[PDB]
Amino acid sequence: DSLDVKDHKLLLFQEVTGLISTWVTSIVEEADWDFERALKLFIQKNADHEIPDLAFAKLGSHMLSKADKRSLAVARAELVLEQIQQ
Amino acid sequence: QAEEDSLDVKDHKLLLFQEVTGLISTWVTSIVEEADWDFERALKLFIQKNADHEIPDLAFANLSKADKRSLAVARAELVLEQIQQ
Amino acid sequence: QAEEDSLDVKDHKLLLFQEVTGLISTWVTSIVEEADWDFERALKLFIQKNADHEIPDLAFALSKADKRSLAVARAELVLEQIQQ
Amino acid sequence: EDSLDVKDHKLLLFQEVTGLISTWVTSIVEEADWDFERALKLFIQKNADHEIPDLAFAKLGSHMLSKADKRSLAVARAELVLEQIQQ
C-alpha cells in the first residue's frame, strides 16, 4: 500500500483506539499493516498492562477520565474486530 | 480547542522523537516527559542516558542493537546542532 | 579555525536536510543555499517548491510519489519542532 | 555488511581523499554499495560529467587553494588512491 493508504489506516486505528501516534505506528507496523492483526495486538498489549492510561489521550480527538478512555478504547477495538471478522 | 492543540503538539513531539531515536514507545514517552516536553532537552537527555548505559538494547524497536544505538546517537546529535542554531 | 567550524555547520545543515528530504545532493545544496543557509527557511522553501511542482520526481534519491509524500511529512514534522 | 561505526570510518576516508561535502560523500559511497574502489571510480565519472560543482570540494584539506584547484587536486588524489588499490 501507498504511504497515502497507510496514513489513512493509521488515522483509523488512532480513531478506534484513541492512542497517541507513537503507539499507533508501533502496533500497526508490528502487525504488518494488517488492521485486524493490529487490533488484536493492541488488545493483547493492553491485557499485559503495556499501555499506560496516559497513552489514550487521543480518544475522542476532533482531528472523560484517562482510565475510562482506556476501557472504552478496548471496547471499541473489540467491537470493530467483531465487524471486520464477520 | 486549545487543550486539544496542546495534546497535538505533544503527540508530534513524541512522534518526531521516535523517528529520530528508534526507541520503543514507552521509552519515547519516558524521556520526553522527563525533559518536560522540551524537545531539545529530550535529545540531550537521550544522549546523556545513552552515554551512561541507562538505555538498554531492548529499548530500540539489517542493523544490530549496537548499530541502532549508534545511528540513534548520530541522528540525535545532528538534529541537536540544528536546534542550537 | 572558525572557517573550518563555519564549513562544518554548513556541511551538517546539508546532511540533515538530505536526511529529512531524501533529495539528491545537488537539490540539497540548491535549496539550502537559496534559503541563505537558514535550516528553517530551507524546510519552508522545500515544502513550497514541492507544492508548486518545482521539485521533480527525478530529484528524490517506495515510488517517487511515496518518497515525495514521505519527504513533505518529515519536513513538516521537523518544521513544527523548530517553530516551538 | 559492516557496522555503522566501520562504514563511518570509510565515509571519513572517502571524504578526506576527495574533499567532498558529506552529502556527496554519502550518495557516492552508498551508490557504490560501500565498495571503496567503485566509489572512487564513480566520483571520477560523475566529476568527468560536470556533475559535481567546484563548491562541493570545500572539505579538501579539512583538519577535524581555490575551489577550482581543490577539484583538480581531489581528482588526482582519487586516481592515486585508486592506483594503490589496483596494485
CSV table of C-alpha atoms in Angstrom, one decimal:
chain,number,residue,atom,x,y,z
A,1,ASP,CA,0.0,0.0,0.0
A,2,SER,CA,1.0,3.6,-0.7
A,3,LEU,CA,2.0,5.9,2.1
A,4,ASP,CA,-1.3,7.7,1.4
A,5,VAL,CA,-3.2,4.5,2.1
A,6,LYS,CA,-1.1,3.6,5.1
A,7,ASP,CA,-1.7,7.1,6.6
A,8,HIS,CA,-5.5,6.6,6.4
A,9,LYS,CA,-5.1,3.2,8.1
A,10,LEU,CA,-3.1,4.8,10.9
A,11,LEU,CA,-5.7,7.6,11.3
A,12,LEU,CA,-8.4,5.0,11.6
A,13,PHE,CA,-6.5,2.9,14.1
A,14,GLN,CA,-5.9,6.0,16.1
A,15,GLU,CA,-9.7,6.9,15.8
A,16,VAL,CA,-10.7,3.5,17.2
A,17,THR,CA,-8.1,3.1,20.0
A,18,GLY,CA,-7.5,6.8,20.9
A,19,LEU,CA,-3.8,6.0,21.2
A,20,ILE,CA,-1.0,8.6,20.7
A,21,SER,CA,0.8,8.3,17.3
A,22,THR,CA,3.9,6.5,18.6
A,23,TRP,CA,1.8,3.6,19.9
A,24,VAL,CA,-0.4,3.7,16.8
A,25,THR,CA,2.6,3.5,14.5
A,26,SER,CA,4.4,0.8,16.6
A,27,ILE,CA,1.4,-1.5,16.8
A,28,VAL,CA,0.2,-1.2,13.2
A,29,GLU,CA,3.8,-1.7,11.9
A,30,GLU,CA,4.3,-4.7,14.1
A,31,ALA,CA,1.1,-6.2,12.7
A,32,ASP,CA,2.5,-5.6,9.2
A,33,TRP,CA,-0.3,-3.1,8.4
A,34,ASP,CA,-2.9,-5.8,8.9
A,35,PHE,CA,-5.7,-3.8,10.6
A,36,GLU,CA,-7.3,-6.9,12.2
A,37,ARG,CA,-3.9,-8.2,13.5
A,38,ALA,CA,-3.2,-4.7,14.9
A,39,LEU,CA,-6.4,-4.6,16.9
A,40,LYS,CA,-5.6,-8.0,18.4
A,41,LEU,CA,-2.1,-6.9,19.2
A,42,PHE,CA,-3.5,-3.7,20.9
A,43,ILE,CA,-5.9,-5.8,23.0
A,44,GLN,CA,-3.1,-8.2,24.0
A,45,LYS,CA,-0.6,-5.5,24.9
A,46,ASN,CA,-3.3,-3.8,26.9
A,47,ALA,CA,-4.1,-7.1,28.6
A,48,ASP,CA,-0.4,-7.3,29.6
A,49,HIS,CA,-0.5,-3.7,31.1
A,50,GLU,CA,1.9,-2.5,28.4
A,51,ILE,CA,0.0,0.7,27.5
A,52,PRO,CA,-0.4,3.4,30.2
A,53,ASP,CA,-3.7,5.2,30.8
A,54,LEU,CA,-2.0,8.4,29.6
A,55,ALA,CA,-1.4,6.9,26.1
A,56,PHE,CA,-5.1,7.1,25.4
A,57,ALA,CA,-5.2,10.9,25.4
A,58,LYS,CA,-6.3,11.0,21.8
A,59,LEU,CA,-9.6,9.2,22.2
A,60,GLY,CA,-12.4,11.5,21.0
A,61,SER,CA,-10.0,13.8,19.3
A,62,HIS,CA,-11.7,16.2,16.8
A,63,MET,CA,-8.9,15.7,14.3
A,64,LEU,CA,-13.8,11.5,30.4
A,65,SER,CA,-11.0,10.2,32.6
A,66,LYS,CA,-7.9,8.6,31.2
A,67,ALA,CA,-8.7,5.3,32.9
A,68,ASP,CA,-12.2,5.4,31.3
A,69,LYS,CA,-10.7,6.2,27.9
A,70,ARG,CA,-8.5,3.0,28.2
A,71,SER,CA,-11.6,0.9,29.0
A,72,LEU,CA,-13.7,2.4,26.2
A,73,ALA,CA,-10.8,2.1,23.7
A,74,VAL,CA,-10.6,-1.6,24.4
A,75,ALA,CA,-14.4,-2.0,23.9
A,76,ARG,CA,-14.2,-0.1,20.6
A,77,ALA,CA,-11.4,-2.2,19.3
A,78,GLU,CA,-13.2,-5.4,20.2
A,79,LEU,CA,-16.4,-4.2,18.5
A,80,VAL,CA,-14.6,-3.2,15.3
A,81,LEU,CA,-12.7,-6.6,15.5
A,82,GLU,CA,-16.2,-8.2,15.6
A,83,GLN,CA,-17.4,-6.4,12.5
A,84,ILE,CA,-14.3,-6.9,10.3
A,85,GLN,CA,-14.2,-10.6,11.2
A,86,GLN,CA,-17.9,-11.4,10.3
B,1,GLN,CA,-9.7,24.0,21.0
B,2,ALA,CA,-6.6,24.8,22.9
B,3,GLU,CA,-6.2,21.8,25.2
B,4,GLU,CA,-6.7,19.6,22.1
B,5,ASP,CA,-4.0,21.5,20.2
B,6,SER,CA,-1.8,21.1,23.3
B,7,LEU,CA,-2.1,17.3,23.1
B,8,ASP,CA,-1.4,17.5,19.3
B,9,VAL,CA,1.8,19.4,19.9
B,10,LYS,CA,2.8,16.7,22.5
B,11,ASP,CA,1.8,13.9,20.1
B,12,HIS,CA,4.0,15.3,17.4
B,13,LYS,CA,7.0,15.8,19.7
B,14,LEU,CA,6.8,12.1,20.7
B,15,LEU,CA,6.4,11.0,17.1
B,16,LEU,CA,9.4,13.0,15.9
B,17,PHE,CA,11.5,11.9,18.9
B,18,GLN,CA,10.6,8.3,18.0
B,19,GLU,CA,11.6,8.9,14.3
B,20,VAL,CA,15.0,10.4,15.5
B,21,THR,CA,15.9,7.7,18.0
B,22,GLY,CA,14.3,4.4,17.0
B,23,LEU,CA,13.2,3.9,20.6
B,24,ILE,CA,10.1,1.8,21.5
B,25,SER,CA,7.1,3.9,22.5
B,26,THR,CA,7.4,3.6,26.3
B,27,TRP,CA,11.0,4.9,26.3
B,28,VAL,CA,9.9,7.8,24.0
B,29,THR,CA,7.3,8.9,26.5
B,30,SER,CA,9.6,8.4,29.4
B,31,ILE,CA,12.5,10.6,28.2
B,32,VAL,CA,10.3,13.3,26.6
B,33,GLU,CA,8.2,13.6,29.8
B,34,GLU,CA,11.4,13.7,31.9
B,35,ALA,CA,12.6,16.5,29.7
B,36,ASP,CA,9.3,18.4,30.4
B,37,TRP,CA,8.3,18.2,26.8
B,38,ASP,CA,11.3,20.3,25.8
B,39,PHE,CA,12.4,18.6,22.5
B,40,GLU,CA,16.0,19.9,22.7
B,41,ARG,CA,16.3,18.8,26.3
B,42,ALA,CA,14.8,15.4,25.4
B,43,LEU,CA,17.5,14.9,22.8
B,44,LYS,CA,20.2,15.9,25.3
B,45,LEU,CA,18.7,13.6,27.9
B,46,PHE,CA,18.7,10.7,25.4
B,47,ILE,CA,22.4,11.3,24.6
B,48,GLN,CA,23.4,11.5,28.2
B,49,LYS,CA,21.4,8.5,29.4
B,50,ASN,CA,22.9,6.5,26.4
B,51,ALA,CA,26.5,7.5,27.4
B,52,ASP,CA,25.8,6.3,31.0
B,53,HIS,CA,24.4,2.9,29.9
B,54,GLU,CA,20.9,3.8,31.1
B,55,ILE,CA,19.3,2.8,27.7
B,56,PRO,CA,19.4,-0.9,27.1
B,57,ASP,CA,19.5,-2.7,23.8
B,58,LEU,CA,15.9,-3.8,24.4
B,59,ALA,CA,14.8,-0.2,24.2
B,60,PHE,CA,15.4,0.1,20.5
B,61,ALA,CA,12.5,-1.0,18.3
B,62,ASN,CA,19.6,-5.1,8.9
B,63,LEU,CA,21.0,-3.4,12.0
B,64,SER,CA,22.2,-4.9,15.2
B,65,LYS,CA,21.2,-3.3,18.5
B,66,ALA,CA,24.6,-1.7,18.6
B,67,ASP,CA,24.2,-0.2,15.1
B,68,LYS,CA,20.7,1.0,16.0
B,69,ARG,CA,22.2,2.8,19.1
B,70,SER,CA,25.0,4.4,17.0
B,71,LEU,CA,22.6,5.6,14.3
B,72,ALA,CA,20.3,6.9,17.0
B,73,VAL,CA,23.0,8.9,18.7
B,74,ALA,CA,24.3,10.3,15.4
B,75,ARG,CA,20.8,11.4,14.4
B,76,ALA,CA,20.1,12.9,17.8
B,77,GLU,CA,23.3,14.8,17.6
B,78,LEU,CA,22.6,16.0,14.1
B,79,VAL,CA,19.2,17.3,15.0
B,80,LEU,CA,20.6,18.7,18.2
B,81,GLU,CA,23.1,21.1,16.4
B,82,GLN,CA,20.2,22.4,14.3
B,83,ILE,CA,18.1,23.4,17.2
B,84,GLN,CA,21.1,25.2,18.7
B,85,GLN,CA,21.3,27.5,15.6
C,1,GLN,CA,39.8,27.7,12.6
C,2,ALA,CA,36.5,29.5,12.7
C,3,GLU,CA,36.4,28.8,8.9
C,4,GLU,CA,36.7,25.0,9.5
C,5,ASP,CA,33.8,25.4,12.1
C,6,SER,CA,31.9,27.6,9.6
C,7,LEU,CA,32.1,24.9,6.9
C,8,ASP,CA,31.3,22.2,9.3
C,9,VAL,CA,28.0,23.7,10.3
C,10,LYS,CA,27.1,24.2,6.6
C,11,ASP,CA,28.1,20.5,5.9
C,12,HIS,CA,25.9,19.4,8.8
C,13,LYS,CA,23.0,21.6,7.6
C,14,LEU,CA,23.2,19.9,4.2
C,15,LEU,CA,23.5,16.4,5.7
C,16,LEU,CA,20.4,16.8,7.9
C,17,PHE,CA,18.5,18.5,5.0
C,18,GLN,CA,19.3,15.5,2.8
C,19,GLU,CA,18.3,13.0,5.6
C,20,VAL,CA,15.0,14.9,6.1
C,21,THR,CA,14.0,15.3,2.4
C,22,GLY,CA,15.6,12.3,0.6
C,23,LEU,CA,16.7,14.7,-2.2
C,24,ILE,CA,19.8,14.1,-4.4
C,25,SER,CA,22.8,16.1,-3.4
C,26,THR,CA,22.5,18.9,-6.0
C,27,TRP,CA,19.0,19.7,-4.9
C,28,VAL,CA,20.0,19.8,-1.3
C,29,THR,CA,22.7,22.4,-2.0
C,30,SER,CA,20.4,24.4,-4.3
C,31,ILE,CA,17.5,24.7,-1.8
C,32,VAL,CA,19.7,25.2,1.3
C,33,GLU,CA,21.8,27.9,-0.4
C,34,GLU,CA,18.7,29.6,-1.7
C,35,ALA,CA,17.4,29.8,1.8
C,36,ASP,CA,20.7,31.5,2.7
C,37,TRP,CA,21.7,28.6,4.9
C,38,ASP,CA,18.7,29.0,7.2
C,39,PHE,CA,17.6,25.5,8.0
C,40,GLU,CA,14.0,26.5,8.9
C,41,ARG,CA,13.7,28.6,5.8
C,42,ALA,CA,15.2,25.7,3.8
C,43,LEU,CA,12.4,23.5,5.0
C,44,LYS,CA,9.7,26.1,4.2
C,45,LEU,CA,11.3,26.6,0.8
C,46,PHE,CA,11.2,22.8,0.2
C,47,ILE,CA,7.6,22.5,1.1
C,48,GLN,CA,6.5,25.5,-1.0
C,49,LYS,CA,8.5,24.4,-4.1
C,50,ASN,CA,7.0,20.9,-3.8
C,51,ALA,CA,3.5,22.3,-3.6
C,52,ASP,CA,4.2,24.4,-6.7
C,53,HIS,CA,5.5,21.3,-8.6
C,54,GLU,CA,9.0,22.8,-8.7
C,55,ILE,CA,10.6,19.6,-7.4
C,56,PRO,CA,10.5,16.7,-10.0
C,57,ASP,CA,10.3,13.0,-9.2
C,58,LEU,CA,13.9,12.7,-10.5
C,59,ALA,CA,15.1,14.9,-7.6
C,60,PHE,CA,14.4,12.2,-5.0
C,61,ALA,CA,17.2,9.7,-4.5
C,62,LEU,CA,8.9,3.2,-2.5
C,63,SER,CA,7.6,5.1,-5.5
C,64,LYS,CA,8.6,8.6,-6.4
C,65,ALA,CA,5.1,9.7,-5.2
C,66,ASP,CA,5.7,7.9,-1.8
C,67,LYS,CA,9.2,9.4,-1.4
C,68,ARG,CA,7.8,12.9,-2.1
C,69,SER,CA,4.9,12.3,0.4
C,70,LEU,CA,7.3,11.0,3.0
C,71,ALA,CA,9.6,14.0,2.5
C,72,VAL,CA,6.9,16.5,2.9
C,73,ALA,CA,5.6,14.8,6.1
C,74,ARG,CA,9.0,14.7,7.6
C,75,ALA,CA,9.9,18.3,6.6
C,76,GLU,CA,6.6,19.4,8.2
C,77,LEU,CA,7.2,17.4,11.4
C,78,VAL,CA,10.7,18.9,11.8
C,79,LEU,CA,9.3,22.4,10.9
C,80,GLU,CA,6.8,22.2,13.7
C,81,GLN,CA,9.5,21.4,16.2
C,82,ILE,CA,11.8,24.2,15.0
C,83,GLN,CA,8.9,26.7,15.3
C,84,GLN,CA,8.1,25.8,19.0
D,1,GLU,CA,27.9,-5.9,5.7
D,2,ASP,CA,29.9,-3.6,8.0
D,3,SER,CA,28.8,-1.9,11.2
D,4,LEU,CA,27.8,1.8,11.1
D,5,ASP,CA,31.0,2.5,13.1
D,6,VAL,CA,33.1,1.0,10.3
D,7,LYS,CA,31.0,2.4,7.5
D,8,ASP,CA,31.5,5.9,9.1
D,9,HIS,CA,35.3,5.5,9.0
D,10,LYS,CA,35.0,4.6,5.3
D,11,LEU,CA,32.9,7.7,4.7
D,12,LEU,CA,35.5,9.8,6.6
D,13,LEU,CA,38.3,8.3,4.5
D,14,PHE,CA,36.4,8.9,1.2
D,15,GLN,CA,35.8,12.4,2.4
D,16,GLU,CA,39.5,13.0,3.2
D,17,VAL,CA,40.6,11.7,-0.2
D,18,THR,CA,38.1,13.6,-2.3
D,19,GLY,CA,37.4,16.6,-0.1
D,20,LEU,CA,33.7,16.4,-0.9
D,21,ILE,CA,30.9,17.7,1.4
D,22,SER,CA,29.1,15.0,3.3
D,23,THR,CA,26.0,14.8,1.1
D,24,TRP,CA,28.1,13.9,-2.0
D,25,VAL,CA,30.3,11.5,0.1
D,26,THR,CA,27.3,9.5,1.3
D,27,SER,CA,25.5,9.5,-2.0
D,28,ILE,CA,28.5,8.3,-3.9
D,29,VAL,CA,29.7,5.7,-1.4
D,30,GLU,CA,26.1,4.3,-1.0
D,31,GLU,CA,25.7,4.2,-4.8
D,32,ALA,CA,28.9,2.1,-4.8
D,33,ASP,CA,27.4,-0.4,-2.3
D,34,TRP,CA,30.2,0.7,0.2
D,35,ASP,CA,32.9,-0.6,-2.2
D,36,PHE,CA,35.7,1.9,-1.8
D,37,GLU,CA,37.2,1.2,-5.3
D,38,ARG,CA,33.8,1.5,-7.0
D,39,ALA,CA,33.1,4.8,-5.2
D,40,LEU,CA,36.4,6.4,-6.3
D,41,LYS,CA,35.6,5.5,-9.9
D,42,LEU,CA,32.0,6.8,-9.6
D,43,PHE,CA,33.4,10.0,-8.2
D,44,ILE,CA,35.8,10.4,-11.2
D,45,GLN,CA,33.0,9.6,-13.6
D,46,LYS,CA,30.5,12.0,-12.0
D,47,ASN,CA,33.2,14.7,-12.0
D,48,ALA,CA,34.0,14.0,-15.6
D,49,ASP,CA,30.4,14.6,-16.5
D,50,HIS,CA,30.4,18.0,-14.7
D,51,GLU,CA,28.0,16.7,-12.1
D,52,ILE,CA,30.0,18.0,-9.0
D,53,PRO,CA,30.3,21.8,-8.6
D,54,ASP,CA,33.6,23.3,-7.5
D,55,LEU,CA,31.9,24.4,-4.2
D,56,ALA,CA,31.3,20.8,-3.3
D,57,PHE,CA,35.1,20.3,-2.8
D,58,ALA,CA,35.2,22.7,0.2
D,59,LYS,CA,36.2,20.0,2.6
D,60,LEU,CA,39.5,19.3,0.8
D,61,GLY,CA,42.3,19.8,3.4
D,62,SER,CA,39.9,19.8,6.5
D,63,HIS,CA,41.6,19.2,9.9
D,64,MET,CA,39.0,17.6,12.3
D,65,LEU,CA,43.7,26.8,-2.5
D,66,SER,CA,40.9,27.9,-4.9
D,67,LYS,CA,37.7,25.9,-5.2
D,68,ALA,CA,38.7,25.0,-8.8
D,69,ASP,CA,42.2,24.0,-7.6
D,70,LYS,CA,40.7,21.7,-5.0
D,71,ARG,CA,38.5,19.9,-7.6
D,72,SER,CA,41.6,19.2,-9.7
D,73,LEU,CA,43.7,18.0,-6.7
D,74,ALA,CA,40.8,15.8,-5.4
D,75,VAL,CA,40.6,14.1,-8.8
D,76,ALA,CA,44.4,13.5,-8.7
D,77,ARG,CA,44.0,12.2,-5.0
D,78,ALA,CA,41.3,9.7,-6.1
D,79,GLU,CA,43.3,8.4,-9.1
D,80,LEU,CA,46.4,7.9,-6.9
D,81,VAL,CA,44.5,6.1,-4.2
D,82,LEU,CA,42.7,4.1,-7.0
D,83,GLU,CA,46.1,3.2,-8.3
D,84,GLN,CA,47.2,1.9,-4.9
D,85,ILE,CA,44.1,-0.3,-4.6
D,86,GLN,CA,44.6,-1.8,-8.1
D,87,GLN,CA,48.1,-3.0,-7.1
